[PDB]
Amino acid sequence: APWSREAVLSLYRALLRQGRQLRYTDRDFYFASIRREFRKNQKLEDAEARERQLEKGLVFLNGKLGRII
Amino acid sequence: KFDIDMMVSLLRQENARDICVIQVPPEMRYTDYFVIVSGTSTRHLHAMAFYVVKMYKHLKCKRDPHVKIEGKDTDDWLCVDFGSMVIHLMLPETREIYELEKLWTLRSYDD
Amino acid sequence: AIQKMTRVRVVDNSALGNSPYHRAPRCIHVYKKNGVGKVGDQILLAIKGQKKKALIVGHCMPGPRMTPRFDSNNVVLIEDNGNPVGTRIKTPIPTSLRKREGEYSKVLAIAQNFV
Amino acid sequence: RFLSPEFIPRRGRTDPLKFQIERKDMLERRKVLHIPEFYVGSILRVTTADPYASGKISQFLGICIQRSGRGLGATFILRNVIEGQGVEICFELYNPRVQEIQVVKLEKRLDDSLLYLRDALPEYSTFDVNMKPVVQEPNQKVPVNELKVKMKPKPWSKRWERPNFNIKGIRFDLCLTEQQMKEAQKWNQPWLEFDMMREYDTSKIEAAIWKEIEASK
Amino acid sequence: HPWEPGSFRVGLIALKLGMMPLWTKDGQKHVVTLLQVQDCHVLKYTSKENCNGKMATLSVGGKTVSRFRKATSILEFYRELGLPPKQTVKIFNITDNAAIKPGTPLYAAHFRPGQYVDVTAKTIGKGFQGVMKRWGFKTGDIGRVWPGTKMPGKMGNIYRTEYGLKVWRINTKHNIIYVNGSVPGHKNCLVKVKDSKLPAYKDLGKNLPFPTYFPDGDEEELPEDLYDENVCQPGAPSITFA
RNA sequence: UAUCUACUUUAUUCCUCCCUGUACGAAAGGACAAGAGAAAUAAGG
Ligand SMILES: [Mg+2]
Ligand SMILES: [Mg+2]
Numbered sequence: 081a082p083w084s085r086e087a088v089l090s091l092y093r094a095l096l097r098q099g100r101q102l103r104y105t106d107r108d109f110y111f112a113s114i115r116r117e118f119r120k121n122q123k124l125e126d127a128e129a130r131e132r133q134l135e136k137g138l139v140f141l142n143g144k145l146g147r148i149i
Numbered sequence: 150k151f152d153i154d155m156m157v158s159l160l161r162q163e164n165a166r167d168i169c170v171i172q173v174p175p176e177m178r179y180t181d182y183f184v185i186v187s188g189t190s191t192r193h194l195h196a197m198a199f200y201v202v203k204m205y206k207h208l209k210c211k212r213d214p215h216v217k218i219e220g221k222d223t224d225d226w227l228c229v230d231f232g233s234m235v236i237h238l239m240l241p242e243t244r245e246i247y248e249l250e251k252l253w254t255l256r257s258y259d260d
Numbered sequence: 261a262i263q264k265m266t267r268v269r270v271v272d273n274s275a276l277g278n279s280p281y282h283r284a285p286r287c288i289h290v291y292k293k294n295g296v297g298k299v300g301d302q303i304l305l306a307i308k309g310q311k312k313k314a315l316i317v318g319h320c321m322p323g324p325r326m327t328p329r330f331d332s333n334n335v336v337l338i339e340d341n342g343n344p345v346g347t348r349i350k351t352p353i354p355t356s357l358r359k360r361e362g363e364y365s366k367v368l369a370i371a372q373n374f375v
Numbered sequence: 376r377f378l379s380p381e382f383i384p385r386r387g388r389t390d391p392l393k394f395q396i397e398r399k400d401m402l403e404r405r406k407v408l409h410i411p412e413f414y415v416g417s418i419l420r421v422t423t424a425d426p427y428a429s430g431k432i433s434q435f436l437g438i439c440i441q442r443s444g445r446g447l448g449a450t451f452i453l454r455n456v457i458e459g460q461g462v463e464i465c466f467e468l469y470n471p472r473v474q475e476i477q478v479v480k481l482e483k484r485l486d487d488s489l490l491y492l493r494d495a496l497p498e499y500s501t502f503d504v505n506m507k508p509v510v511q512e513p514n515q516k517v518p519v520n521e522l523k524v525k526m527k528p529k530p531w532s533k534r535w536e537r538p539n540f541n542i543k544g545i546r547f548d549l550c551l552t553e554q555q556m557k558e559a560q561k562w563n564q565p566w567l568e569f570d571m572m573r574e575y576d577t578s579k580i581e582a583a584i585w586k587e588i589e590a591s592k
Numbered sequence: 593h594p595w596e597p598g599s600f601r602v603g604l605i606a607l608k609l610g611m612m613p614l615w616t617k618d619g620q621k622h623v624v625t626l627l628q629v630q631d632c633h634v635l636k637y638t639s640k641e642n643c644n645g646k647m648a649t650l651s652v653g654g655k656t657v658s659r660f661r662k663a664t665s666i667l668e669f670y671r672e673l674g675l676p677p678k679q680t681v682k683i684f685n686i687t688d689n690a691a692i693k694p695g696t697p698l699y700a701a702h703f704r705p706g707q708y709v710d711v712t713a714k715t716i717g718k719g720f721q722g723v724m725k726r727w728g729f730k731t732g733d734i735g736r737v738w739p740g741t742k743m744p745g746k747m748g749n750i751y752r753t754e755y756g757l758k759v760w761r762i763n764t765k766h767n768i769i770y771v772n773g774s775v776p777g778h779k780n781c782l783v784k785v786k787d788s789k790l791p792a793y794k795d796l797g798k799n800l801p802f803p804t805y806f807p808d809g810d811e812e813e814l815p816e817d818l819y820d821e822n823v824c825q826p827g828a829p830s831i832t833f834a
Numbered sequence: 835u836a837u838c839u840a841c842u843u844u845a846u847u848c849c850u851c852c853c854u855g856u857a858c859g860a861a862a863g864g865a866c867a868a869g870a871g872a873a874a875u876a877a878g879g
């Protein structure tokens with residue numbers, strides 16, 4: 081129902097690997113905010129919205145629209 | 150100088166309750182650094198506002214413009230803009246409803 | 261120039277704006293000495309029998325040169341204390357809100373785009 | 376040869392020395408910044424510094440819909456719709472906070488002023504922001520794009536039907552009645568095309584200006 | 593003499609060429625009138641004793657005009673003086689320290705950028721106008737209309753002075769002064785350009801050349817065009833606000 | 835449908851900011867002045 085299987089957890093762990101490269105901010109509120117972006121959203125959704133939210137996960141990973149420091 | 154490092158010094162020296170900044174890329178021509186920070190209450194956010202304008206005003210940068218604290222009368226929100234950066238002192242509930250951390254990372258990719 | 265009685269195209273994610281209503285939202289008061297509002301002024305506004313403060317984001321009469329000119333009277337709602345009602349603003353917002361004296365920093369955190 | 380309209384003065388009883396001075400400053404700006412040939416149909420993208428951002432620049436793309444103004448203070452206003460919203464900006468051509476003016480699609484429309492695009496369908500006014508500059512060949516006249524647009528209903532910005540406007544880029548047949556057309560032919564002024572004292576001949580003006588151009592080189 | 597604190601110097605008479613924009617380094621337009629100095633000269637010096645005024649006076653005239661169209665007293669005046677006759681002669685109140693010999697050219701670089709200046713000219717005459725255009729509007733026991741009542745009548749064609757106008761740029765070659773904002777009068781009108789009387793600007797005559805500017809002095813000659821510090825010159829790189 | 839008299843070119847204010855959150859008070863409180871701004875009106879272009 082998402083774009084694929086491995087891609088979702090790949091982007092997840094990739095955001096965590098940027099989560100340790102985070103430098104200035106409270107990293108646990110950061111990680112809890114990653115949770116609330118992923119826990120309450122990625123449970124019981126239609127297969128189309130899975131695509132769009134993994135695409136905003138893609139863009140949130142890349143950070144050409146800004147990056148958390 | 151008064152950099153974002155100095156801002157981290159001012160806010161962790163105040164012990165701000167919650168910190169999350171975004172480096173705004175130069176195309177989206179608002180600012181460079183977008184600080185989102187919460188505190189205890191109106192007294193806390195208010196006092197740390199007067200603290201950071203106190204330290205910027207007292208610190209350096211005479212030729213740079215004096216900076217007005219916005220929303221002194223409202224309770225939950227407070228915001229202060231500089232040359233490079235803009236800080237938003239608010240409440241984490243107010244943060245929950247205005248969801249700014251999503252916006253400045255997802256410019257067209259959110260609600 | 262957005263005076264009294266002008267029809268107003270509200271740009272918000274607000275409940276008051278995007279709710280359908282039989283009357284178009286129109287201005288009632290302008291908070292200047294002359295009753296003429298420009299980009300970055302506060303007005304009273306009648307939405308659904310509810311008067312409400314509002315902030316003018318771009319109008320249709322031409323201003324200075326390098327600034328933009330819209331094809332409607334785009335207006336963002338605001339509350340009495342000064343924080344806006346809205347959550348997202350879709351239509352582009354001029355950067356000319358930055359220099360003016362007043363509550364503008366709150367609104368510029370909300371814009372999708374900037375013109 | 377293409378001489379941009381800002382160099383040709385409007386007639387008037389001002390002194391030619393003042394335009395000597397203005398043209399001197401205009402060419403001294405045209406050393407630094409490259410001002411290209413563009414008409415009133417062409418799609419432009421302009422990079423400007425921002426007085427509100429700290430030395431950040433910006434890009435606006437649209438249609439040049441008017442080339443008004445003469446001299447150093449001359450403008451062009453370009454239009455685009457984005458986010459379901461129409462925006463126009465008056466750009467001063469010699470304001471030193473403009474960095475480049477790239478011509479995406481050099482083309483001439485049927486009219487000299489496309490202000491009627493405010494009342495056309497928004498599809499006739501929308502453009503891609505990241506659209507690529509189409510390549511023109513060096514030695515050729517310009518593509519005169521004709522496109523009789525479609526108009527939104529009757530309460531327009533101005534009565535474009537009236538023959539004082541001389542609008543050519545309208546499919547009037549779709550959006551106007553024959554009775555209202557024949558009503559609009561009341562304000563015709565057929566003599567006005569035929570008087571020889573209203574005709575401002577810019578020919579020797581063009582000569583002295585092209586020796587101003589060559590002498591600045 | 594050198595400049596003493598409290599002394600006044602000469603003004604000018606200039607054509608109004610027209611207007612043009614001028615952008616400063618902060619990216620703001622300033623509409624600027626050009627004022628060409630055409631054949632300005634000092635015509636007669638009268639001391640305060642012969643004037644019976646409070647101060648000495650210099651008569652200065654501009655824009656050479658036909659000898660075939662003047663009264664013979666005027667032609668005798670200019671004949672003895674040794675000049676072709678000027679169109680207007682304006683009179684400057686002046687201290688003894690600034691008194692150039694009658695018959696000397698005044699140039700554009702008498703003023704320098706940064707200096708503030710007052711300009712007087714006849715306003716554009718609108719002829720007989722009524723109350724709505726002239727004054728901008730529209731007792732019983734008083735059986736008469738007070739003096740100075742606002743009524744229709746001849747509008748314009750009167751001397752008015754715009755006070756405190758910044759000089760932005762002077763062009764030494766063509767003798768142009770580029771002054772801030774608007775000056776009274778139509779194009780090609782003659783204006784009287786003196787240093788400003790505004791008391792915020794009464795002491796900045798330190799750096800101004802005190803009798804007048806003399807190119808004949810040959811000391812450290814001037815460029816094409818003096819600019820004020822804040823003026824974006826043409827030919828400078830396109831300005832960035834970083 | 836104007837006969838007579840008379841007549842027909844005699845700079846303020848608000849807000850912001852700073853000084854200063856100093857003076858003053860003892861805490862609460864909290865200046866002036868002068869300065870920069872942005873507005874608005876009037877006056878003159
Ligand atoms: Mg209209
Ligand atoms: Mg009486």
